[PDB]
């Protein structure tokens, strides 16, 4: 009933994606998986980080379930995650951070959603060295903000607030220093907020906002922000609710959608069989909800929450004393899905 | 003994700076204050955000004590804080975050120092709109990284780690996406680390680093990073130890130094008399240490810690339990300094 492109990815990717596929299949939803390669795995196998066939598959299916993809630091290929977002026009990156009962966290009542502009800003891919012959004397990177990109991400945030019965959108910016890019984003946000008098609207400078998230994250409902600030703030929120092992993100465009964990390929624990699969499984729930399987999505989320509240078959990031591994935690979630 | 340029600043600035001055004088250190105006106050009084006389005074005295300065969002004058840092070549922004016994915080053992590049990156002041006639269709902002700016900030971080007997420098970057600017910063840091084999060296991508700071700030020692990332991370750290009301920063160049609170002018509580003066007082401590008054600095810090640990004369940001105002807390600290 559903044909979905499946990208196992790099590092801990293949294990957690395996786990998530098992959990999805436990719900009874019918999925034809279209397995494709990307990232470092594809570099190793096909000599390119993004085979044409992978992108063709996503453009045909319109739905993609993607494990984490390694991006090299300081050189090498540009992020395949970013290329995918831009090639498929997945302009909204929606990252819920909602507390899980039972976590060893200072807070237990976090309930926020980050809506991150997903196609431009400091992710435009525009940079250069300033060189004399072969000597690098400086470097520059260009952040790009368009009127039309800002309009769609901010309207997405307000529409989402309505659809989710949330009450407030907070626009996060650095418009005192970045008067042009951040300033244009903020000005457009104030402009669009008047179209949504049912929704409260305020704005915060990103550094004060980070302090406030650490001290009282309960203040936040929907956050809307640009690409890099969204990346940072959503990882902060993940930390608040118990780690990157827990949090998922939906990359939404008008014609396509790609679901993934927020975290990366975790090279420090690759092949050790201990990665928390919760984030990938929650990405599965979000994907199921998007494609019109809300009951299966709710059962997955309830099963994850029950297993984490019980606390006996969870990975070491969640319980340090007597933990199990990726596969055992996933099997516990499969059993709760079936009950 | 010491002639110091004094800038009361904006919003809560004048009250907290007043508090700090009293505490400094309670130590017995001899200060000739050279009062000058900057920021919005100067706009209102002199029609310019940075009178020439203010800059002349700082370049004559080489030491400046500066309350928070308002910067307008989306337009208006460029940050006077940034202009001062750049005009005086104050390339190192040093921000300690060390837990205060008695705070209502998840952690009690945070002990880290952020070393933020203070003159370039996304604070270079290079931006533009893309317009057709008067219609803004897009905007761009340019981050600038130079070889020599990176070299000097990273060497400052290692030298500071040695001088302070700290054991690890962590360089924070986004070099997977910002391959040219962040990538050059990272590459230079790796080269310079080999000049300091006594100092432990690693690197973190900024979003994972934010997650790690909220979950486990004890892993961090000295952080070295670029301008915007340093701003965001140091405010995160301020949150971890109990708020912006507590944390101070030193802007260091070879020929001058400017000491300030990390927080801003706090317009939401300006003129309410409730702002926490701790951050400004700690900025005074850092200033006293810099100008060769370490015992007075240590006495100020001890007095602040005693007053916060006691908890009876503290401002509402620390406890809305039995709260007092700015002037209370300052008098309590003066009395403690003064035994
Ligand atoms: N969109 C995604 O594909 C994704 C997101 C972020 C990082 N990136 C890529 O991942 C690579 C590694 O980056 P990084 O080390 O800074 O970030 P990371 O997310 O891989 O790791 C950060 C920390 O979280 C831990 N880890 C994250 N997943 C968690 C769970 N599943 N298990 C419990 N611990 C887990 C890691 O062990 C590590 O200590 C980079 O090449 C980066 O480009 C990909
Ligand atoms: N002077 C510089 O170092 C710099 C520092 C940051 C902000 N700026 C300027 O300050 C203005 C306000 O910015 P903002 O609102 O995002 O940040 P802010 O620091 O002024 O306020 C953030 C929050 O922290 C609280 N506040 C900060 N000072 C603390 C005080 N000592 N104790 C109790 N209240 C605390 C405020 O009430 C507010 O709720 C802006 O114009 C900004 O450019 C000054």
TrEMBL record, chains A, B:
Q: Which residues bind NAD(+) 2?
A: 71, 176, 260, 264-266, 268
Pfam families found in the cross-reference section: Iso_dh (PF00180)
Write down the species: Methylococcus capsulatus (strain ATCC 33009 / NCIMB 11132 / Bath)
- Indicate whether Nucleotide-binding appears among the record's keywords: yes
**SMART domains assigned to the protein according to its UniProt record, in alphabetical order:** Iso_dh
Keywords of the record: Nucleotide-binding, Oxidoreductase
Chain sites annotated for binding NAD(+) 1? 66, 69, 71, 81, 176, 264-266, 268
UniProt superkingdom = Bacteria
Kindly provide the name given to this protein in its UniProt entry. Answer: Putative isocitrate dehydrogenase, NAD-dependent
Lineage, opening ranks: Bacteria, Pseudomonadati, Pseudomonadota, Gammaproteobacteria, Methylococcales
The biological process GO terms on file are: isocitrate metabolic process; tricarboxylic acid cycle
Family of this protein = Belongs to the isocitrate and isopropylmalate dehydrogenases family.
What residue stretches are annotated with the Isopropylmalate dehydrogenase-like domain? Answer: 3-333
Q: Which GO terms describe its molecular function?
A: isocitrate dehydrogenase (NAD+) activity; magnesium ion binding; NAD binding
């Amino acid at each position: 009933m559903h044909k979905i492109t499946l990208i196992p990815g790099d590092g801990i990717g293949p294990s957690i994606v395996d786990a998530a596929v098992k959990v999805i299949e436990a719900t009874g939803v019918q999925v034809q998986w279209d397995t494709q390669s990307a990232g470092m795995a594809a570099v190793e196998k096909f000599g390119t980080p993004l085979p044409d066939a992978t992108l063709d598959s996503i453009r045909a299916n319109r739905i993609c379930f993607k494990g984490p993809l390694t991006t090299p630091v300081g050189g090498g290929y540009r992020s395949v995650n970013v290329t995918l977002r831009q090639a498929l026009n997945l302009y909204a990156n929606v990252r819920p951070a909602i507390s899980f009962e039972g976590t060893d966290t200072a807070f237990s009542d976090v309930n926020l959603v980050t809506v991150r502009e997903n196609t431009e800003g400091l992710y435009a891919g525009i940079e250069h060295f300033i060189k004399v012959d072969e000597e690098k004397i400086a470097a520059e990177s260009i952040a790009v903000v368009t009127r039309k990109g800002s309009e769609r991400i901010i309207r997405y945030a307000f529409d989402y607030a309505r659809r989710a019965r949330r009450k407030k959108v907070t626009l996060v910016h650095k418009a005192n220093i970045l008067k042009c890019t951040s300033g244009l984003f903020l000005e457009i946000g104030r402009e669009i907020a008047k179209e949504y008098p049912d929704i409260e609207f305020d704005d915060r400078i990103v550094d004060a906002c980070s302090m406030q998230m650490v001290m009282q994250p309960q203040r936040f409902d929907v956050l809307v922000t640009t690409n890099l600030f969204g990346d940072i703030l959503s990882d902060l929120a993940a930390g608040l609710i118990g780690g990157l092992g827990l949090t998922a993100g939906a990359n939404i465009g008008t014609d396509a959608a790609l679901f993934e964990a927020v975290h990366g390929s975790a090279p420090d624990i690759a092949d050790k069989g201990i990665a928390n699969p919760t984030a990938m499984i929650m990405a599965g729930a979000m994907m199921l909800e998007h494609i019109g399987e809300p009951d299966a999505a709710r059962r997955i989320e309830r099963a994850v929450r029950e297993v984490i509240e019980d606390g006996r078959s969870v990975t070491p990031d969640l319980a340090k004393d007597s933990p199990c591994g990726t596969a055992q935690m996933a099997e516990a979630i499969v059993e709760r899905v079936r009950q």
